[PDB]
Amino acid sequence: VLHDGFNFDPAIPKADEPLTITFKAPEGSNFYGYADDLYLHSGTGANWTGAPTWGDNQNKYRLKKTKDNVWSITLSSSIRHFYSVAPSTPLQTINLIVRDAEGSQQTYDYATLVEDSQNGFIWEEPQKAPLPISGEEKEGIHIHSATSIMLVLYDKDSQGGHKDCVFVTGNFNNWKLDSRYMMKYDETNHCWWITLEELTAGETQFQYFVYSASDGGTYLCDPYCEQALEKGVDTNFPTGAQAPYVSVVSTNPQPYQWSAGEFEMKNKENPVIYELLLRDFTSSGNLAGAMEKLPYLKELGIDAIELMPVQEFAGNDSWGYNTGLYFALDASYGTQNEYKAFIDACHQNGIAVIFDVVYNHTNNDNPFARMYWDTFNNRPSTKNPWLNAVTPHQKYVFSPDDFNHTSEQTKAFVKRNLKYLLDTYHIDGFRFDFTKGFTQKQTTGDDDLAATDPARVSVLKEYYEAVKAVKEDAMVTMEHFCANEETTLATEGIHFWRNMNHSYCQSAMGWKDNSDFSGLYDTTRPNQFVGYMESHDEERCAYKQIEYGNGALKTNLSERLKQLSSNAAFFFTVPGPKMLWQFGEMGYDISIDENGRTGKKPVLWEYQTERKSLVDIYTKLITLRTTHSDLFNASSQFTWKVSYNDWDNGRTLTLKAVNGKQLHVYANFTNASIDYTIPEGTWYLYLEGNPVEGEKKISVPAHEFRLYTNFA
Ligand SMILES: C[C@H]1O[C@H](O[C@H]2[C@H](O)[C@@H](O)[C@@H](O[C@H]3[C@H](O)[C@@H](O)[C@@H](O)O[C@@H]3CO)O[C@@H]2CO)[C@H](O)[C@@H](O)[C@@H]1N[C@H]1C=C(CO)[C@@H](O[C@H]2O[C@H](CO)[C@@H](O[C@H]3O[C@H](CO)[C@@H](O)[C@H](O)[C@H]3O)[C@H](O)[C@H]2O)[C@H](O)[C@H]1O
Ligand SMILES: *[C@]1(O[C@H]2[C@H](O)[C@@H](O)[C@H](O)O[C@@H]2CO)O[C@H](CO)[C@@H](O[C@H]2O[C@H](C)[C@@H](N[C@H]3C=C(CO)[C@@H](O)[C@H](O)[C@H]3O)[C@H](O)[C@H]2O)[C@H](O)[C@H]1O
Ligand SMILES: C[C@H]1O[C@H](O[C@H]2[C@H](O)[C@@H](O)[C@@H](O[C@H]3[C@H](O)[C@@H](O)[C@@H](O)O[C@@H]3CO)O[C@@H]2CO)[C@H](O)[C@@H](O)[C@@H]1N[C@H]1C=C(CO)[C@@H](O)[C@H](O)[C@H]1O
Ligand SMILES: [Ca+2]
Ligand SMILES: [Mn+2]
């Protein structure tokens, strides 16, 4: 008789008969050993028709405690009568939460099936049928014709089980559960499948209703959809559909015409990457707005644009590290073809495109989450074959839905997604967010998490090789911050984020403490470390000047732009890839905390004019890496004096190519003029270039730098 959670007498609920619901609290569950009665919060259909006001303690909602940990309620006369549902309304699901009288403790959204014989909704045994397709990529949406789609949904839990039945519901059947739209299970491929025929018009909209005795029922969309509507964002979200997502398929849509040619990233070994958030890059916050600035970024001299995450994220106002769907791009920035047009336009301006991708975690809206959910703890169940119930790395819990990168299903999904983004959107590489998170080890801090995990190392190689198999020259960058695993993986050709924000903020402010630049240059493999003074995750160097700058650096914009141009002179002149965060080149100086860390920031394109002196220095330093590439080859000899102890008298670097070409830079980061003797040789002021005698004493004013080449 009674199992954990909800029990029904009758075992198959009947819309036009009474129902006894018995709730049994498992050991370790929040209502285990609870002394008082519980209350029912319930309604019918996708949208909980008949739900009371939360906390409504009328006696007809009371589950009387009958035994220890067992509460029962009877929906008397009939389920239909209890919810005042019209006879003709198909009553096909009931949604159940139990709570304390106060409404402080509860269970979470759960649904069971209701048989409604009087409206033609009769129980049938689900069919076992082999999947009629072989091939790779069996799961997902297959368009066979203008009027027909095959749907394949993976279902095997980590204990070897599967659901009792799955319905497809959509615009083709007015969002009803219908025995005609029950999918068939293939026990060998572990997949539900159905062929929808006689679809009419352009857009098919659907979601699945999955159901088991142990888990109850859930609505979810297809994980592989390329288009989705999101309740609370899309005004056209169907009234029949449950939040959050409906999959959208166009059988014969407008194909995008790509311009002709290969396209390959320029300076592919050591690119300058421009990190860009579409939400905040222009006032329209979208691809259309950003497309208008490509001429600006082209002139700047950048090799690549890195977009912050564009995969479908929760809502329409986000950095995007909250992915709900991985094969649909967020419609808040543009359509599929607007993304393709953007990427095509970048390629025609000679600019590569990198996508920021977030595989550590998804969110509660993801079909992989919804499919195997714990309605007691409101997190993935211990049976979920893609996700952990509980994040193993407890120092970093960015959502309730942490991916298990030891799951063969998760690895296959990630590998398939990488290939999809390469093939469909023609991008030039990837920045993998938080690759430190790709670990099953139980940890609670930074040092236990950063310790070598051989399975994390091996899975990151696996994802690297999967990208390389699709596109041999694709750039693969990982935001890792595990020093020892970076040494190992840099050997394979993986690039790593190298955060020099603290040092370059200290130098921008005129403070010598913790200002050492030396971590920008990795002696073992200079080209594998993507150095940056700023990223979306960091405070702006120019903001720190205003708030805490040494002396005049708080108030004098001229002296601030000079100090930042001197930082740039100790950054774009260093071998290996470089990254700048949008508007760093114009001294963007709004705190990361203005409007909250992740909130929309002011759009300040007038800075391009007011701080043109800084934009022009960025432009010339970036362009030097093209004009004199051979200088920035990893083979060049690179030395510099940029420690805590290199300050009172200035800082220096020298880059010497094998062909004899030399670059030398001096900077005075102090608040007073310094005397400096140029090194021996014949030098030119390349940024502005008449000759200069070596071993010649010069007075370098506060905040300024001198750049010399031994050529012109
Ligand atoms: C933010 C960063 O956190 C980690 O980085 C750690 C690092 O692992 C640790 O080693 C150390 O590294 C420093 C070192 O101490 C310094 O000496 C120097 O060398 O620099 C290194 C590198 O900085 O300190 C780092 C900083 O703490 C992690 O490893 C990185 O991957 C992280 N950056 C990524 C990842 C995420 C998560 O996807 C992004 O975070 C943004 O978005 C999330 C999710 O929305 C936000 O999460 C919070 O707010 C949410 C509500 O919006 C909540 O739902 C959630 O529960 C909250 O956690 C978060 O605030 C955003 O920053 C990030 O932007 C990516 O770039
Ligand atoms: C509770 O929510 C409380 C919050 O937990 C607390 O943070 C806040 O201060 O107070 C809230 C109450 O004021 O009450 C919710 C409302 O009943 C309850 O939601 C459950 O039941 C509702 C009916 C479900 N919503 C469905 C119905 C509609 C109505 O159109 C649709 O818009 C939704 O998409 C449907 O899902 C909801 O899903 C349930 O969880 C909370 O559980 C409860 O904590
Ligand atoms: C003047 C001082 O400015 C800078 O220090 C500031 C930090 O940059 C800010 O981030 C902020 O740090 C606070 C954190 O926000 C907070 O999380 C918590 O950790 O408290 C921190 C406050 O201590 O505020 C700092 C200013 O208090 C800059 O980094 C720092 O080097 C500057 N220090 C100079 C000043 C003195 C004394 O006048 C000398 O001793 C130092 O050597 C100078 O460098
Ligand atoms: Ca969205
Ligand atoms: Mn993780």
Short mmCIF file of C-alpha atoms in Angstrom, two decimals, residues 147-547:
data_model
loop_
_atom_site.label_atom_id
_atom_site.label_comp_id
_atom_site.label_asym_id
_atom_site.label_seq_id
_atom_site.Cartn_x
_atom_site.Cartn_y
_atom_site.Cartn_z
CA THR A 147 3.78 18.59 -42.61
CA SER A 148 5.64 15.92 -40.54
CA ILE A 149 8.16 15.86 -37.67
CA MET A 150 9.62 12.92 -35.76
CA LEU A 151 10.28 13.61 -32.02
CA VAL A 152 12.83 11.47 -30.07
CA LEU A 153 13.14 12.03 -26.25
CA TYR A 154 15.87 10.20 -24.25
CA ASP A 155 14.65 8.60 -21.01
CA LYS A 156 16.81 6.35 -18.88
CA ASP A 157 17.37 7.40 -15.22
CA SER A 158 20.72 6.61 -13.50
CA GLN A 159 19.13 3.50 -11.81
CA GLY A 160 18.16 2.01 -15.27
CA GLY A 161 14.43 3.00 -15.03
CA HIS A 162 12.18 5.12 -17.32
CA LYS A 163 8.79 6.91 -17.30
CA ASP A 164 5.45 5.02 -17.60
CA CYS A 165 4.22 7.28 -20.49
CA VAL A 166 4.90 10.49 -22.48
CA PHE A 167 2.37 12.66 -24.34
CA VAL A 168 3.16 15.29 -26.98
CA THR A 169 0.83 18.30 -26.61
CA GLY A 170 0.78 21.43 -28.79
CA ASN A 171 -0.97 23.77 -31.19
CA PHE A 172 -1.87 20.67 -33.38
CA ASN A 173 -4.21 19.32 -30.58
CA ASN A 174 -5.15 22.47 -28.56
CA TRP A 175 -2.67 21.54 -25.71
CA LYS A 176 -4.62 18.44 -24.56
CA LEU A 177 -3.39 15.06 -23.35
CA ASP A 178 -4.62 12.61 -26.05
CA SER A 179 -3.99 8.82 -26.25
CA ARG A 180 -3.38 9.43 -30.05
CA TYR A 181 -0.28 11.53 -29.13
CA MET A 182 1.25 8.99 -26.66
CA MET A 183 4.88 8.29 -27.68
CA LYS A 184 6.28 4.72 -28.03
CA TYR A 185 9.31 3.51 -26.00
CA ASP A 186 12.36 1.79 -27.50
CA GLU A 187 13.97 -0.03 -24.43
CA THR A 188 17.26 -0.59 -26.41
CA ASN A 189 17.90 3.06 -27.46
CA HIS A 190 16.12 4.21 -24.23
CA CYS A 191 14.02 6.70 -26.32
CA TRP A 192 10.34 7.77 -26.61
CA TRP A 193 9.37 8.61 -30.21
CA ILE A 194 6.42 9.68 -32.39
CA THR A 195 5.95 10.95 -35.98
CA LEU A 196 3.50 13.90 -36.15
CA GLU A 197 1.80 13.97 -39.62
CA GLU A 198 -0.61 16.55 -41.20
CA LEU A 199 0.89 19.54 -39.33
CA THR A 200 -0.42 22.66 -41.17
CA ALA A 201 0.91 26.26 -41.47
CA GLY A 202 4.47 27.36 -40.52
CA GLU A 203 5.15 27.05 -36.76
CA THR A 204 4.44 23.88 -34.76
CA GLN A 205 4.46 24.58 -30.98
CA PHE A 206 4.73 21.67 -28.50
CA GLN A 207 5.83 20.40 -25.11
CA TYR A 208 5.97 16.89 -23.66
CA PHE A 209 4.02 15.63 -20.61
CA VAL A 210 6.20 12.89 -19.00
CA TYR A 211 4.70 10.67 -16.26
CA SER A 212 5.69 7.90 -13.81
CA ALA A 213 3.99 6.42 -10.66
CA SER A 214 7.18 7.30 -8.66
CA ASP A 215 7.72 10.92 -9.99
CA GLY A 216 4.22 11.97 -11.04
CA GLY A 217 3.91 14.12 -14.15
CA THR A 218 5.75 17.14 -15.62
CA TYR A 219 5.52 19.35 -18.73
CA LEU A 220 8.88 20.14 -20.50
CA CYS A 221 10.03 21.20 -23.99
CA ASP A 222 12.50 19.36 -26.28
CA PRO A 223 16.14 19.85 -25.23
CA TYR A 224 17.23 20.11 -28.94
CA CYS A 225 14.76 22.83 -30.11
CA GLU A 226 16.35 25.71 -32.09
CA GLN A 227 13.50 28.08 -31.17
CA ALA A 228 11.36 28.41 -28.03
CA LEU A 229 8.79 30.71 -26.42
CA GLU A 230 9.35 31.63 -22.76
CA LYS A 231 6.38 32.42 -20.49
CA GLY A 232 6.86 35.96 -19.06
CA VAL A 233 8.96 37.10 -22.06
CA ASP A 234 6.97 36.04 -25.17
CA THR A 235 3.49 37.76 -25.26
CA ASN A 236 2.40 34.86 -27.63
CA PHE A 237 3.20 32.07 -25.08
CA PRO A 238 0.15 29.77 -25.51
CA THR A 239 -2.53 29.81 -22.74
CA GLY A 240 -2.73 25.96 -22.96
CA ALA A 241 1.07 25.46 -22.38
CA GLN A 242 2.70 25.21 -18.88
CA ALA A 243 5.60 27.59 -18.00
CA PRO A 244 8.42 27.86 -18.80
CA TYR A 245 9.13 26.82 -22.45
CA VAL A 246 7.33 25.65 -25.61
CA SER A 247 9.46 24.28 -28.49
CA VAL A 248 8.83 25.95 -31.91
CA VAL A 249 9.56 24.11 -35.22
CA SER A 250 9.30 25.72 -38.67
CA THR A 251 9.26 22.87 -41.26
CA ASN A 252 10.06 25.10 -44.35
CA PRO A 253 11.70 28.35 -43.04
CA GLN A 254 13.85 31.18 -44.62
CA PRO A 255 17.39 29.74 -45.01
CA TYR A 256 20.25 32.29 -44.40
CA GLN A 257 22.64 32.91 -47.39
CA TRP A 258 26.27 33.00 -46.08
CA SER A 259 28.75 35.29 -47.94
CA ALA A 260 31.44 33.28 -49.89
CA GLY A 261 34.98 32.33 -48.61
CA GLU A 262 36.75 30.29 -45.83
CA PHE A 263 37.29 33.05 -43.22
CA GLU A 264 40.15 32.35 -40.76
CA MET A 265 40.94 34.44 -37.64
CA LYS A 266 43.93 36.80 -38.20
CA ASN A 267 46.78 36.64 -35.65
CA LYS A 268 45.28 33.20 -34.75
CA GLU A 269 48.21 32.25 -32.41
CA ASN A 270 47.99 35.48 -30.25
CA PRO A 271 44.72 37.32 -30.95
CA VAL A 272 43.33 40.48 -29.33
CA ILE A 273 39.83 39.49 -28.15
CA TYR A 274 37.08 42.05 -27.46
CA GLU A 275 34.63 40.76 -24.81
CA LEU A 276 31.11 42.05 -25.54
CA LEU A 277 27.73 41.84 -23.69
CA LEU A 278 24.97 42.43 -26.32
CA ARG A 279 22.57 43.67 -23.56
CA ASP A 280 24.86 46.65 -22.64
CA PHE A 281 27.03 47.15 -25.81
CA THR A 282 24.35 49.45 -27.42
CA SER A 283 21.07 51.16 -26.38
CA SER A 284 18.96 48.63 -28.37
CA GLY A 285 20.76 45.80 -26.44
CA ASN A 286 20.67 43.39 -29.45
CA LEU A 287 22.50 42.14 -32.58
CA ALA A 288 20.98 44.94 -34.79
CA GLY A 289 22.53 47.60 -32.49
CA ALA A 290 25.93 45.80 -32.32
CA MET A 291 26.07 45.27 -36.15
CA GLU A 292 26.20 49.13 -36.54
CA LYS A 293 29.44 49.24 -34.42
CA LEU A 294 31.44 46.63 -36.46
CA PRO A 295 33.25 49.46 -38.35
CA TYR A 296 34.33 50.89 -34.94
CA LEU A 297 35.68 47.48 -33.75
CA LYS A 298 37.34 46.80 -37.17
CA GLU A 299 39.21 50.17 -36.93
CA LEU A 300 40.20 49.36 -33.28
CA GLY A 301 42.20 46.44 -34.78
CA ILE A 302 40.68 43.47 -32.80
CA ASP A 303 41.10 39.85 -34.12
CA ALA A 304 37.96 38.48 -32.39
CA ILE A 305 34.70 39.37 -30.58
CA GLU A 306 33.77 37.14 -27.62
CA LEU A 307 30.01 37.29 -27.00
CA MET A 308 28.85 36.72 -23.43
CA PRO A 309 26.37 33.80 -23.42
CA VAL A 310 23.69 33.95 -26.15
CA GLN A 311 22.15 30.50 -25.53
CA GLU A 312 18.50 30.80 -24.27
CA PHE A 313 18.79 32.15 -20.65
CA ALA A 314 16.12 32.77 -17.93
CA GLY A 315 14.15 35.92 -18.93
CA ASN A 316 15.51 38.68 -21.23
CA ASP A 317 17.79 40.76 -18.88
CA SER A 318 20.97 38.80 -18.04
CA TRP A 319 24.74 38.37 -18.42
CA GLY A 320 23.49 34.94 -19.65
CA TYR A 321 25.20 32.50 -17.15
CA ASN A 322 21.73 30.97 -16.54
CA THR A 323 21.17 28.75 -19.63
CA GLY A 324 17.76 26.99 -19.94
CA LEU A 325 18.17 25.65 -23.52
CA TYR A 326 21.48 24.97 -25.39
CA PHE A 327 20.32 24.63 -29.06
CA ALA A 328 18.09 27.78 -29.03
CA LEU A 329 19.76 31.24 -28.93
CA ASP A 330 18.02 33.92 -26.82
CA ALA A 331 15.37 35.67 -29.00
CA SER A 332 15.86 38.88 -26.87
CA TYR A 333 19.09 39.55 -28.89
CA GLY A 334 17.67 38.40 -32.28
CA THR A 335 16.34 35.54 -34.50
CA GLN A 336 18.48 32.57 -35.64
CA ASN A 337 19.16 34.49 -38.94
CA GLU A 338 20.06 37.76 -37.13
CA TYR A 339 22.77 35.74 -35.23
CA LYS A 340 24.01 34.29 -38.57
CA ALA A 341 23.92 37.81 -40.20
CA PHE A 342 25.93 39.27 -37.25
CA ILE A 343 28.60 36.50 -37.47
CA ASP A 344 28.74 36.85 -41.33
CA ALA A 345 29.16 40.68 -40.95
CA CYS A 346 32.02 40.13 -38.38
CA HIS A 347 33.74 37.69 -40.88
CA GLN A 348 33.38 40.29 -43.75
CA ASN A 349 35.18 42.88 -41.46
CA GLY A 350 37.92 40.27 -40.77
CA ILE A 351 36.70 39.68 -37.15
CA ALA A 352 36.28 36.14 -35.68
CA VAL A 353 33.39 35.30 -33.25
CA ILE A 354 33.84 33.26 -30.01
CA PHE A 355 30.76 32.09 -28.03
CA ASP A 356 30.93 32.02 -24.20
CA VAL A 357 29.32 28.63 -23.27
CA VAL A 358 28.08 27.58 -19.80
CA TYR A 359 28.18 23.79 -19.21
CA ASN A 360 28.88 23.79 -15.43
CA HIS A 361 25.15 24.26 -14.71
CA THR A 362 21.77 24.95 -16.34
CA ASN A 363 18.59 26.09 -14.53
CA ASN A 364 15.25 24.67 -13.32
CA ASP A 365 13.64 25.40 -16.78
CA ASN A 366 15.96 22.93 -18.65
CA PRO A 367 14.12 19.79 -19.83
CA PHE A 368 17.02 17.70 -18.37
CA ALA A 369 16.18 19.21 -14.90
CA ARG A 370 12.37 18.94 -15.27
CA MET A 371 12.56 15.30 -16.53
CA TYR A 372 14.06 13.96 -13.23
CA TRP A 373 13.09 16.39 -10.45
CA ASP A 374 12.81 16.02 -6.63
CA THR A 375 9.44 17.57 -5.57
CA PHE A 376 10.44 17.29 -1.85
CA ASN A 377 13.75 19.25 -2.11
CA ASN A 378 13.03 21.22 -5.35
CA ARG A 379 16.26 20.17 -7.10
CA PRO A 380 17.28 17.36 -9.48
CA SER A 381 16.47 13.86 -8.21
CA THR A 382 19.24 11.35 -7.35
CA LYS A 383 17.97 9.43 -10.52
CA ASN A 384 18.76 12.37 -12.88
CA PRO A 385 21.18 10.96 -15.51
CA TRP A 386 22.57 14.44 -16.52
CA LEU A 387 22.56 16.50 -13.29
CA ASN A 388 23.67 16.14 -9.67
CA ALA A 389 20.98 16.45 -6.96
CA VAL A 390 23.42 18.62 -4.93
CA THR A 391 26.42 20.60 -6.36
CA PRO A 392 29.61 18.70 -5.35
CA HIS A 393 31.75 21.96 -5.30
CA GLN A 394 29.91 23.72 -2.42
CA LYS A 395 32.12 26.89 -2.64
CA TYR A 396 30.45 27.72 -6.03
CA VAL A 397 26.68 27.06 -6.31
CA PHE A 398 25.56 29.19 -9.31
CA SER A 399 22.22 27.36 -9.67
CA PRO A 400 20.44 24.32 -8.28
CA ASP A 401 21.24 22.37 -11.60
CA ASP A 402 24.93 21.31 -11.73
CA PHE A 403 25.91 19.00 -14.65
CA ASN A 404 27.59 15.66 -13.93
CA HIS A 405 30.49 15.69 -16.46
CA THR A 406 31.18 11.97 -15.64
CA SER A 407 27.73 11.12 -17.19
CA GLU A 408 28.13 9.67 -20.74
CA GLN A 409 24.73 11.36 -21.54
CA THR A 410 26.09 14.80 -20.39
CA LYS A 411 29.37 14.42 -22.37
CA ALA A 412 27.47 13.34 -25.54
CA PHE A 413 25.11 16.33 -25.10
CA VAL A 414 27.97 18.85 -24.66
CA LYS A 415 29.93 17.37 -27.65
CA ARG A 416 26.79 17.47 -29.82
CA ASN A 417 26.07 21.12 -28.76
CA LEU A 418 29.67 22.26 -29.56
CA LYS A 419 29.43 20.71 -33.08
CA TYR A 420 25.93 22.28 -33.58
CA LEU A 421 27.22 25.84 -32.73
CA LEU A 422 30.28 25.35 -35.02
CA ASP A 423 28.21 23.92 -37.98
CA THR A 424 25.11 26.17 -37.69
CA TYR A 425 26.61 29.54 -36.64
CA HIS A 426 30.12 29.21 -38.31
CA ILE A 427 31.80 30.59 -35.11
CA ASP A 428 35.61 30.53 -34.70
CA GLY A 429 35.91 29.16 -31.14
CA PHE A 430 34.61 28.91 -27.56
CA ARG A 431 35.16 30.33 -24.09
CA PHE A 432 34.07 27.60 -21.60
CA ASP A 433 32.77 29.33 -18.43
CA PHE A 434 33.86 27.85 -15.03
CA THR A 435 35.62 24.65 -16.26
CA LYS A 436 36.80 24.29 -12.63
CA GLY A 437 33.15 23.24 -12.00
CA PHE A 438 33.42 20.12 -14.26
CA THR A 439 34.17 17.85 -11.22
CA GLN A 440 32.18 15.26 -9.14
CA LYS A 441 34.59 15.50 -6.12
CA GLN A 442 32.91 16.68 -2.85
CA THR A 443 34.67 20.01 -1.90
CA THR A 444 33.80 23.03 0.30
CA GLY A 445 36.54 25.65 -0.47
CA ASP A 446 38.96 26.99 -3.11
CA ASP A 447 42.11 24.81 -2.45
CA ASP A 448 40.29 21.41 -2.39
CA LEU A 449 38.38 22.39 -5.62
CA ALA A 450 41.58 23.72 -7.37
CA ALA A 451 43.51 20.41 -6.59
CA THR A 452 44.05 18.19 -9.68
CA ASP A 453 40.97 16.08 -10.54
CA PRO A 454 42.10 13.60 -13.22
CA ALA A 455 38.44 13.20 -14.45
CA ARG A 456 38.11 17.03 -14.87
CA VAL A 457 41.45 17.09 -16.85
CA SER A 458 40.34 14.14 -19.03
CA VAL A 459 36.79 15.53 -19.77
CA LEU A 460 38.20 18.99 -20.70
CA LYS A 461 40.61 17.21 -23.21
CA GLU A 462 37.55 15.28 -24.49
CA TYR A 463 35.60 18.54 -25.16
CA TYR A 464 38.78 20.18 -26.68
CA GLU A 465 39.29 17.18 -29.08
CA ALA A 466 35.54 17.20 -30.01
CA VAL A 467 35.82 20.91 -31.11
CA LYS A 468 39.13 20.19 -33.04
CA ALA A 469 37.47 17.18 -34.86
CA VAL A 470 34.78 19.61 -36.21
CA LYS A 471 37.10 22.64 -36.82
CA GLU A 472 40.89 22.01 -36.62
CA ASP A 473 41.68 25.79 -36.20
CA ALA A 474 38.80 26.66 -33.72
CA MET A 475 40.19 28.62 -30.69
CA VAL A 476 39.28 26.86 -27.40
CA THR A 477 39.63 29.02 -24.25
CA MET A 478 38.72 27.86 -20.72
CA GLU A 479 38.15 30.02 -17.62
CA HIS A 480 39.77 27.48 -15.28
CA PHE A 481 41.97 29.02 -12.51
CA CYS A 482 43.48 25.55 -11.47
CA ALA A 483 47.22 26.32 -12.01
CA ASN A 484 48.46 22.64 -12.23
CA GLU A 485 45.70 21.47 -14.61
CA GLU A 486 46.37 24.59 -16.78
CA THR A 487 50.06 23.50 -17.16
CA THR A 488 48.86 19.99 -18.34
CA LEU A 489 46.04 21.25 -20.61
CA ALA A 490 48.05 24.24 -22.09
CA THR A 491 50.37 21.47 -23.44
CA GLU A 492 47.37 20.11 -25.50
CA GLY A 493 46.65 23.54 -27.13
CA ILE A 494 43.91 24.78 -24.71
CA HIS A 495 44.01 28.54 -23.94
CA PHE A 496 43.36 29.81 -20.34
CA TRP A 497 42.09 33.11 -18.87
CA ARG A 498 44.92 34.90 -17.04
CA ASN A 499 43.44 37.54 -14.69
CA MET A 500 45.78 40.58 -14.19
CA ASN A 501 42.93 42.92 -13.10
CA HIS A 502 44.26 43.35 -9.50
CA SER A 503 47.78 44.45 -10.67
CA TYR A 504 46.55 46.77 -13.47
CA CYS A 505 43.91 48.33 -11.08
CA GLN A 506 46.74 48.96 -8.54
CA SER A 507 48.91 50.54 -11.29
CA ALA A 508 45.93 52.55 -12.74
CA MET A 509 45.37 53.97 -9.22
CA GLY A 510 49.10 54.83 -8.72
CA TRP A 511 49.57 52.27 -5.86
CA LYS A 512 52.73 50.09 -6.02
CA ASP A 513 51.28 47.48 -3.53
CA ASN A 514 50.30 44.22 -5.35
CA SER A 515 50.95 45.91 -8.78
CA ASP A 516 53.29 43.23 -10.30
CA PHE A 517 52.47 42.72 -14.05
CA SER A 518 54.63 39.57 -14.45
CA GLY A 519 51.70 37.04 -14.46
CA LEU A 520 50.54 38.48 -17.85
CA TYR A 521 53.47 36.68 -19.56
CA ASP A 522 53.70 32.88 -19.14
CA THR A 523 57.38 31.93 -19.84
CA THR A 524 56.59 28.20 -20.52
CA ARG A 525 53.80 28.80 -23.14
CA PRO A 526 53.13 32.56 -23.62
CA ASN A 527 50.52 31.92 -26.37
CA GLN A 528 48.27 29.63 -24.19
CA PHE A 529 47.37 32.43 -21.61
CA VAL A 530 44.72 35.07 -22.55
CA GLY A 531 45.82 38.00 -20.35
CA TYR A 532 43.37 40.81 -19.44
CA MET A 533 43.32 43.95 -17.34
CA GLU A 534 39.46 43.80 -17.32
CA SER A 535 36.67 41.24 -17.82
CA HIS A 536 32.87 41.39 -17.23
CA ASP A 537 33.66 39.80 -13.76
CA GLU A 538 35.98 42.66 -12.60
CA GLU A 539 35.76 46.26 -11.36
CA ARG A 540 36.86 48.82 -14.05
CA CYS A 541 40.46 50.18 -13.67
CA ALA A 542 39.09 53.67 -14.50
CA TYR A 543 36.40 53.41 -11.72
CA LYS A 544 39.10 52.52 -9.10
CA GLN A 545 41.00 55.73 -10.09
CA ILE A 546 37.97 57.95 -9.23
CA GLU A 547 37.21 56.25 -5.88
#
